[PDB]
Chain A
Amino acid sequence: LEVEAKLAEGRKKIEVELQEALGSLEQQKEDTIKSLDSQISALSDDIVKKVLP
């Protein structure tokens, strides 16, 4: 029981850790999407010079 209940609580703690990590990653991804805009612009220009002959 006691070990089992402890394990269940540990599983909940792991879920909290995992739930939080995903949220942090999502926030980071949003910032990146906001960030490195020049790549976007220049990145856009990117294909253009090589797409055609």
Chain B
Amino acid sequence: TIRNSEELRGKAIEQLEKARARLKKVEMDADQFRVNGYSEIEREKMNLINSTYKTLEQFEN
């Protein structure tokens, strides 16, 4: 009986802590992903405007 509860508690805490550590890491991945996405969106917006200005100029031609 003693060897069981301890193992459960050992294993259990290794697992809660591990799960929350993973949460942190993701909190990290997402955090990273959000920054990348934001930059990509800005560039894409830039894409649209730039290319449409090119299209304008061609229309003027």
Question: Which residues of A are in contact with B by a Cβ distance under 8 Å?
Answer: 2-4, 6-7, 10-11, 13-15, 17-18, 21
Contacts and interface: CB of A to CB of B under 8 A. Distances in A.
Contacts of B55: 11, 14
A18 B59 contact: yes
Contact of A14 (B45, B46, B56): B56
Given A7-B52, A11-B52, A21 B45 contact: no
A14 B49 contact: no
Contact count band on B? 10 to 19
23 contacts: A2-B45, A3-B45, A3-B46, A4-B48, A6-B49, A7-B49, A7-B52, A7-B53, A10-B49, A10-B52, A10-B53, A10-B56, A13-B56, A14-B53, A14-B55, A14-B57, A14-B59, A14-B60, A15-B59, A17-B56, A17-B60, A18-B59, A21-B60
Q: Give the dominant DSSP class at B's interface.
A: helix
Interface string B33-47: 000000000001110
